[PDB]
């Protein structure tokens, strides 16, 4: 129910903007956002949390905005090791993690 | 630092019900959530519920809500700081639509607005 | 409330401990530490009470020569260079207890005295200038 | 003019001793109180001398901890409840002494010290959030 | 930069050693001045423990009184009676030692402790009548 992009690239050094919304029910003012980058099958690693809070180690390229409608993730700088599958997280601070459809990049 | 070593790879078949393992190390098990995460084939990836292995309280979500069973056992002092855990995964009326791999993952930080959010997990586990 | 009590946020993070400071700072002058007789009871107790006024004399002309008098929480003129800790905010107030905060930063401990000892100077220096006029 | 000397005005008006606290405030730390020797009056000046420093700090504690350090005359937060004391401020101030008021508000200054000591940590903590910006 | 140590600036000019003040305040309860045994040496030692936490002790409840806690550099509303010194701004700070000063200050030192004394109470006396409002 948590839309993201369907799919989309770039190239390396340029950047990427992935895609997140839904209904009241899971975006977006009264919500957090969280950016999970996730191979298909093996250890997921947070990026960031509360919207754009990245996680401690993520590079800086790695970025979060949320408008009122729709949280965005920007990919700038792009490297190789960046051909994953991204997700996000609708919350709050007393729930679950309703996880997005998915992105591939 | 934090690990967090899971179970083997169980393989049974519909009506059953199994036991996940998660063993952690490197960081006081009391004072984050352990959340289990379901990354099914057929479906998005799923956060089943998480656990308090400090006041024991749990929460997950309605898709689970009768159906599955988290427990943790208390934690083992090493240092001031550091302990040894283990948390419990089962599921009740289990078919064969489950079937992926199962993570656990603990929680963020110690307060706020997200305290229970998953952050380090584990290596995840095939089923049937 | 709450009210832990003496050291009953140790466990805490720090976040949460630093709310209640006044607990931990009206027992570092008291406890329960009138002639003064030199017995083997007299000798230790009169022990006990020079050295409390003594370490805490201590912590409040640290205060002092910091521009700190009288706080609780004050607040200063250093930035905080990276490496002594790179933690961020959050993964400080809201995570970690004031005893592992002290266990990792014990090594900059004294550089830090120092800048806040000579941010003060200055800045007692300063004010006088602004008040020649 | 006046000057009475050390508690000189203890029979005055409050609001008359209260215009001569400085009189009081310097023999808390001086009166006559250079080898140790431990003779019967050695003992006895040594104890004499602890004595007034620890007295002394204790009460500077207080101060602190009300965010009143350095101050005869410190105005604060706490509302006066009137269950303390329902007197006017001219039937005090210009009728009363402080020994016959410390004699009546003597049940509460406990509570009085709790209320004092909660506000200036409260404050301390809002005085760093409005720096935080 | 130059950093003389304990001191070190004593023969310096009364407006260069007054940059350095903090080099003279850390070193006036620390030195190296557990158990208290009463031997020769263990009396000897609690005289010195005692002796520098009293002589501390009475130079800061002069700066309590004269409203300048916690300030290594103060200023105040004594106006500079000539009779004290005739000198020039210039030919003290960028001439004189502090020493020196000293020795021709010395006569009029209580006669100036006494007027900070009662700037401050009277002081704090108006800041209480203007938060009355
Ligand atoms: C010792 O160490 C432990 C482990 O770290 C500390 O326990 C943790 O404390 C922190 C903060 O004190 C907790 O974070 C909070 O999490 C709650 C989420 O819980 C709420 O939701 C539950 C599920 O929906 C619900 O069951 C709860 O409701 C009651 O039920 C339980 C049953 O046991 C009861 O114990 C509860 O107390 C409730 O009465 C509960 O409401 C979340 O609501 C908090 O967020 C709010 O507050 C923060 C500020 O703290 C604010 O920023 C937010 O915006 C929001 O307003 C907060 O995130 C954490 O859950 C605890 N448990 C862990 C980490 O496992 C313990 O406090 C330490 N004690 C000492 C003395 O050191
Ligand atoms: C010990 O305790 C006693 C008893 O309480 C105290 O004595 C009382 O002190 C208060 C204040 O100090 C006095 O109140 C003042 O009253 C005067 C009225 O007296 C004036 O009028 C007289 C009649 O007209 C006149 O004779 C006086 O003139 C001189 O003569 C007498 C002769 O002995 C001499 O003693 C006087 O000193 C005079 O030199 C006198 O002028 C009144 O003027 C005062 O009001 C002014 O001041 C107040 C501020 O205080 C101000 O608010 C007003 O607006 C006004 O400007 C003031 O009300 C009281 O009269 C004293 N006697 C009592 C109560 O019986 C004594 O002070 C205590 N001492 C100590 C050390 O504790
Ligand atoms: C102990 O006591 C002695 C004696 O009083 C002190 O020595 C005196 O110190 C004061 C201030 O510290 C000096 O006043 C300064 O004078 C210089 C002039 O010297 C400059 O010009 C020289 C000739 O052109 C030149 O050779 C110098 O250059 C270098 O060479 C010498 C070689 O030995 C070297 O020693 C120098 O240090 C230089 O490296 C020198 O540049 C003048 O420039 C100063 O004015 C500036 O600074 C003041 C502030 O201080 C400012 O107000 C001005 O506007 C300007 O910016 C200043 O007037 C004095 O010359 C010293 N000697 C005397 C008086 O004989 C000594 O400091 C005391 N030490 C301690 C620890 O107490
Ligand atoms: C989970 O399993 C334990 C096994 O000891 C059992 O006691 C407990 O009741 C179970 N939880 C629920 C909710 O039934
Ligand atoms: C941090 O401190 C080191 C020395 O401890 C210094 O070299 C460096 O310049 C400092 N960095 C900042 C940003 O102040
Ligand atoms: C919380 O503090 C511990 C202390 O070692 C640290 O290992 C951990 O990474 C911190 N948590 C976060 C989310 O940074
Ligand atoms: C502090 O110094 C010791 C010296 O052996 C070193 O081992 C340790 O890593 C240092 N810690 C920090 C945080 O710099
Ligand atoms: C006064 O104090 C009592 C308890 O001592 C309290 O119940 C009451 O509410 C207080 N009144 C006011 C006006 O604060
Ligand atoms: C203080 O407490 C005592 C207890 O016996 C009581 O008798 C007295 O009246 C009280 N005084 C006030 C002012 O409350
Ligand atoms: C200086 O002090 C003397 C007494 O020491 C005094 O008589 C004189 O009026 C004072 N002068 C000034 C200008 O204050
Ligand atoms: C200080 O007093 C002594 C008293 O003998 C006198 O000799 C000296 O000149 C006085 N000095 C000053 C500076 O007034």
């Known amino acids: 129910v948590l839309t993201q992009s369907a799919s989309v690239s770039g190239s390396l050094g340029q950047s990427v903007t992935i895609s997140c919304t839904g209904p009241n029910s899971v975006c977006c003012s009264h919500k957090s956002i969280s950016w999970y980058q996730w191979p298909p099958g093996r250890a997921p690693t947070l990026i960031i949390y509360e919207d754009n809070e990245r996680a401690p180690g993520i590079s800086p390229r790695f970025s979060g905005y949320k408008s009122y409608w729709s949280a965005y993730l920007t990919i700038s700088d792009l490297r190789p090791e960046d051909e994953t599958t991204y997700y996000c997280c609708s919350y709050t601070h007393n729930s679950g993690c309703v996880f997005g459809t998915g992105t591939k990049v | 630092q934090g690990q967090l070593v899971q179970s083997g790879a169980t393989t049974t078949k519909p009506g059953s019900s199994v036991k996940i393992s998660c063993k952690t190390s490197?960081?006081?098990?009391?004072?984050?959530?352990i959340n289990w995460i379901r990354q099914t084939a057929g479906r998005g990836p799923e956060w089943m519920g998480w656990?308090?292995?400090?006041?024991?309280?749990?929460?997950?979500?309605?898709?689970?809500?009768?159906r599955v069973n988290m427990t943790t056992d208390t934690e083992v002092p090493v240092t001031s700081f550091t302990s040894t855990g283990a948390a419990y995964m089962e599921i009740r009326n289990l078919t064969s639509d489950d079937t992926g791999t199962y993570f656990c993952?603990?929680?963020?930080?110690?307060?706020?607005?997200?305290?229970?959010?998953?952050?380090?997990w584990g290596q995840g586990t095939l089923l049937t | 409330a709450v009210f832990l009590g003496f050291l009953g946020a140790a466990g805490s993070t720090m976040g949460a401990a630093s709310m209640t400071l006044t607990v931990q700072a009206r027992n570092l002058l008291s406890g329960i530490v009138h002639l003064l007789k030199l017995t083997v009871w007299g000798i230790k107790q009169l022990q006990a009470r020079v050295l409390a006024v003594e370490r805490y004399l201590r912590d409040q002309q640290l205060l002092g020569i910091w521009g700190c008098s009288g706080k609780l929480i004050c607040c200063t003129n250093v930035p905080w260079n990276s490496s002594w800790s790179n933690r961020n905010l959050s993964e400080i107030w809201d995570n970690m207890t004031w005893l592992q905060w002290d266990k990792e930063i014990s090594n900059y401990t004294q550089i830090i005295y120092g800048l806040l000892e000579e941010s003060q100077n200055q800045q007692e220096k300063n004010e006088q200038d602004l008040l020649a006029l | 003019a006046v000057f009475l000397g050390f508690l000189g005005a203890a029979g005055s008006t409050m609001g008359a001793a209260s215009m001569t606290l400085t009189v009081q405030a310097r023999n808390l730390l001086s009166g006559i109180v250079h080898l140790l020797k431990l003779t019967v009056w050695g003992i006895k000046q040594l104890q004499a001398r602890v004595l007034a420093v620890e007295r002394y700090l204790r009460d500077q504690q207080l101060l602190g901890i009300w965010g009143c350090s350095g101050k005869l005359i410190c105005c604060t937060n706490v509302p006066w409840n009137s269950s303390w004391s329902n007197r006017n401020l001219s039937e005090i101030w210009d009728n009363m002494t402080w020994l016959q008021w410390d004699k009546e508000i003597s049940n509460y200054t406990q509570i009085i010290y709790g209320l004092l000591e909660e506000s200036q940590n409260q404050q301390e903590k809002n005085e760093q959030d409005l720096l935080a910006l | 930069a130059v950093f003389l140590g304990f001191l070190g600036a004593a023969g310096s000019t009364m407006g260069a050693a007054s940059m350095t003040l903090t080099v003279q305040a850390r070193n006036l309860l620390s030195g190296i001045v557990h158990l208290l045994k009463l031997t020769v040496w263990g009396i000897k030692q609690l005289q010195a423990r005692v002796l520098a936490v009293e002589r501390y002790l009475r130079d800061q409840q002069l700066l309590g009184i004269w409203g300048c806690s916690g300030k290594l550099i103060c200023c105040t509303n004594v106006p500079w009676n000539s009779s004290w010194s005739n000198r020039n701004l210039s030919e003290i700070w960028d001439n004189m030692t502090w020493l020196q000063w000293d020795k021709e200050i010395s006569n009029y030192t209580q006669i100036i402790y006494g007027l900070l004394e009662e700037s401050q109470n009277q002081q704090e006396k108006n800041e209480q009548d203007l938060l009355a409002l």
């Open positions: 656990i308090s292995p400090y006041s024991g309280d749990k929460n997950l979500a309605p898709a689970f809500q009768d």
């Open positions: 490197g960081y006081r098990f009391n004072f984050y959530h």
């Open positions: 993952a603990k929680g963020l930080l110690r307060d706020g607005s997200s305290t229970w959010l998953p952050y380090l």
